Design a protein around this ligand. Structure first.
Ligand SMILES: O=C(O)c1ccccc1O
Ligand SMILES: O=C(O)c1ccccc1O
Ligand SMILES: O=C(O)c1ccccc1O
Ligand SMILES: O=C(O)c1ccccc1O
Ligand SMILES: [Fe+2]
Ligand SMILES: [Fe+2]
Ligand SMILES: [Fe+2]
Ligand SMILES: [Fe+2]
Lengths: 364, 364, 364, 364
């Protein structure tokens, strides 16, 4: 039980003879690899990701995105002026974790990013800015500060800046999962967006964003949320109410001074998309979360306030827009200096769907 | 296939002899009843309810409720000054249909209706009035015009009029189902309500009424909705948006000029309670719905405007507050003279859960 | 909490005046019934069925069925020479409980019972006999001692005696539920059965009765089991193995000396049909089950051995073939004198689907 | 729509200036990778696995396994004398596909392989041999020709040869998925097996292998099958019956002359384990399956008879024991020369759980 791969007796060490070396040589020629030389690496005691905890500064991401807006035109082929966060441990792949892409995207004055679709699921999140509409299956969706915008797999999407000012946001996708697992399909759509209109609220929201109500034309459940925009207003109100209810001595917050919501598919009560979980957390000044180990990877973006993250015992100070990744089973906690708002995403739906999820919480 | 119980050959007619009569007599003594004398009644070609279509006028219901407020005190024992709509076909039982109670309730100035709970599921709907709070598991819930209020089975509930003016509403319960099926439990609670405070919005709403958002403290799914109030604002907005989207040529309405929503449990996307489905319909002036036959019973209350219902080919003119029941498989349609808003409930979740549901729609 | 409808203060007793009597008279004229005169009956503290516990002797059921085979021809119209057990508490209805029909059926030498279908779900169980095939959607299904045969709602079924000797079995249906709830449809099929062949095993069994295996042509889940026959061999083997595993000190039996199985839909792991649960119990000699209160009704048939049932504290000695009903919430236990085998059915799937199920077990 | 990554206009080619090269250099320093240089590789038109179709000959696998039994002792540390099939396209990883390990394992006379558990799900399949018991959570499970044995994640398992003759089998696991996704946990158990007894049938089978029957002590559904052994008898009988039913003109086979089953979890009707689907196929002599493209990877082992596989248009002749892998979206078909039996496994449950599954069938 307490034994690990370092301390266990190694009882399968063959005698090193010419017959043994010839056996190993013939394994190579036959595309055979023995378990007994490999076991501890293939099957660790607990997860040990090649990805490392890492933090990217928003100020740095903005500088690089802005310079890219100056030097690189957006359009067909390359599709998006998007910069992926590449984990230092992941071999030069544009993967923030083994399952997820997280990237900054920049659309300059009056630019269009052309329409396409792909089996890969996607969302947009906005720490700051306005001006862009993303048109999802023909339905123009305004992008504003604090909004989560969804683009489920196989939905046509294109983006356009309707103003004379640049805008930046983050993209999350299951690109790394999808590449390694061979589930990717892609289709080019129109070179412009199919609708340039700029309504305040999308058709999706107009049908689906009334609490506890479901259109009779929408009684079929969906694999992904039909809500195209989870607007900041509602997120802000939800979190405030939780802290207000806590004041009044009423259950609501997930832990003391820790308000939090999960963005959900309203047809099921489940996650927004099959591979991706999105959450939003608001911590009271002075709140320190209990340290968690969780299977699978998570990424946060600081939306507002000041604080720190601790990963593997290491404290990193965080500011507005900063992004960090916690790989599988890395102990993590957040510490709020001011009231501390963060946007969160993860691959937890994959882990939970396949019964791989485990959680260790300090004090429990 | 085209044969029915009237036209089929009756091939089990025994010879009427003293031996046969002695056999039938001994069936009675042994508590045995033969199928062959009974078949057509026990197993009809299509449903043939003992309940009949029937309409009750709100003006009449109000008169009787008001007089009851003058002559009958509310309190313990009797519990509620509630008048049940009793279907003429249902043998003197206080059943609007074989599954459902529908009733008018009246609470006068400053009165309290004391706390209790029961396995029977319940909701309140308000065509008109204000002043009452219903306190559900200690959580005061304001009752206003156009609101649906829920009281799932086994939740403690009491009601109090916080003003000097009377209020009336309708109650729906699965009382008849629960009586006939032997599932009823009941417990007396406090003689007053446990909280006299009168907040604008309940704790339940404050956690659960933000579209597409779920508290992390509420990740467990519930058998009934945790939303205690489905406020008129949202219902009205939903219905308007559907008619607006229809104008713009966009799918939304369930049929031409027919906007409609289903009130739902946000943890599942399903019905508010296991036995009871609630809906709200808004018809454009001049809309006539396609005639439907549906398994199980439904009840409507006219919330606003003027129109008619047709049941079994018979037109009945309807006004604000009027209530009608459509028993199982009775052909029904609605005709809007002005824009015509109706609140709807039914036992459809029971039928659908047990795979008994069938639907015939005229033109399909 | 400890108050009941007998001991609670009755605080809604109006003054008995001509104005009050005129109010009550006008309730009658308007088809209105007040809650306050009715409450305790409509909403009891715990279930109080109109059905009573009752036992029918197989010797008596056989005598009556045999005499019916002499005096009453089987055929069209009457459809089946079936005798329903009619609960003394259920008003002359051919209902063994408020939800279920339980009946003895008799098919004499060479007789055919013609084909039909109905939304009502059905099963056959055989304490004794052979010779009959029931043809279900064209698929001949042999009927033998100890077999459970299924006939899910809307499946065409007819029965024929292929021998010169009579056979009797029991039928269970959701007839009473279906009548009271208005879900019944019925269709006459062919006057004879569509296939007179008499294979040992049906096509359904040949596809579906291999443990842990599912045909690739059957990947769609079904609302009812596609297994047409649950043969005695497997039931007997299952129960024996549980008692053997218990001997070996291994978990298997549901309680000490109490082996039991539930017949299941193999596509879901759930109940055989939406309204009806079937089980088979085998008790070691000397086993006495802990007393249970359960919501909803259950019926047993003694298949073999000798024992007793206790209901409401009353012991009734039982022999092979005897049948008894336990209405909702009646305390019940079984006592085995010899090894005691019983077939069981109930309306528990209805109760569980609608979250009405409760269970009290003595000692827990 | 018809455009691909080769033929699309590349409109994001920046001017190659020192400012651009400095921008790209600073991307490297900041752990940023741009989408626009990467798009076509990250997001292909359809899947394009690094894994290639490949076939391994059983004669070759046996030779290498036998020599390993001579030169390499089995025991602690290395754990298993197992040889993994390593796809030539997968970079030297011991992965037959991106999701699955498939390997030959060899246990010589009287040897024990010691107990352990791991989150990785596993099964054993036997083309030939007898003598080994695998003890799963203390429950000895006989291993015989044609049997599928399961070892769901986190179950303690060890293996022992109870005879004087060697035995070989194949192992399938979700090792590659689990490594790349960081879900692996591992625990060492006892150095020997905890029970050396050698019963014909395990406790799991004795509870769970009776068709359509479920123990009342097992009403809780499981994430993986509780059946530890899917014995050849039942698999053989199922397949025969399908071909017999086809002869009789009755629906059963999945395609003409193509009998097939899926091994299932009896508590749900679903797959044996969350990550792994197992099937068994029997083709009539002369049957050629319609060509399929399927998302995700599959592996077959020829159990009996002679035939061929076609992958990417290439025919490879197959004999008893031979193994082949079809990576994601590779067109594949089987051709039977004699009656042709194959065991199949795949990662299809992962694809279906996450809504990534697509299927193209030739002629449909
Ligand atoms: O569609 C996008 O905006 C996008 C952004 C980043 C990565 C892949 C994408 O398709
Ligand atoms: O609780 C109520 O207000 C009520 C109203 C009508 C019928 C039964 C009830 O419990
Ligand atoms: O089909 C039958 O055999 C039957 C038996 C009893 C009651 C109703 C029925 O349809
Ligand atoms: O337990 C096994 O036999 C085994 C076999 C191959 C790979 C990993 C394993 O744990
Ligand atoms: Fe995209
Ligand atoms: Fe009540
Ligand atoms: Fe019938
Ligand atoms: Fe293992």
């Amino acid at each position: 039980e307490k034994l690990d791969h370092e301390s266990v007796t190694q009882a399968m060490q063959p005698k090193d003879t010419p017959e043994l070396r010839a056996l190993y040589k013939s394994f190579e020629e036959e595309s055979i690899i023995p378990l007994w030389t490999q076991l501890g690496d293939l099957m660790p005691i607990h997860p040990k990701s090649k990805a490392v905890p890492h933090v990217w500064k928003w100020s740095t991401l903005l500088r690089l995105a802005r310079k890219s807006g100056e030097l690189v035109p957006v359009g067909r082929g390359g599709e998006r002026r998007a910069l992926g966060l590449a984990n230092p441990g992941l071999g030069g792949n544009a993967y923030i974790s083994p399952t997820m892409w997280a990237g900054i995207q920049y659309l300059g004055p009056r630019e269009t990013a052309p329409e396409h679709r792909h089996s890969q699921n996607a969302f947009r999140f906005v720490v700051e800015g306005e001006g862009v509409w993303t048109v999802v299956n023909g339905d123009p969706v305004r992008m504003s500060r604090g909004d989560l915008l969804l683009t489920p797999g196989w939905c046509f999407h294109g983006h356009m800046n309707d103003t004379d000012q640049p805008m930046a946001w983050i993209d999350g996708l299951d690109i790394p999962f999808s590449q390694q697992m061979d589930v990717g399909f892609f289709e080019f759509g129109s070179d412009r967006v199919t609708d340039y209109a700029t309504p305040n609220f999308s058709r999706g929201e107009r049908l689906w964003c009334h609490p506890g109500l479901r259109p009779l034309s929408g009684l079929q459940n969906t694999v992904a949320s039909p809500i195209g925009a989870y607007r900041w207003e509602f997120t802000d109100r939800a979190l405030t109410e939780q802290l207000l209810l806590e004041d009044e001595g009423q259950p609501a917050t997930v832990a003391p001074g820790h308000a939090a919501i999960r963005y959900v598919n309203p047809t099921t009560g489940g996650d927004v998309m099959p591979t991706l979980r999105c959450e939003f957390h608001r911590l009271r000044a002075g709140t320190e979360t209990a340290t968690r180990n969780e299977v699978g990877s998570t990424v946060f973006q600081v939306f507002e306030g000041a604080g720190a993250v601790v990963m593997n015992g290491e404290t990193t100070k965080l500011e507005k827009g900063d992004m960090f990744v916690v790989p599988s089973w890395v102990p993590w906690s957040l510490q709020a200096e001011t009231q501390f708002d963060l946007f969160r995403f993860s691959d937890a739906p994959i882990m939970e769907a396949l019964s791989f999820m485990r959680t260790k919480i300090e004090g429990q």
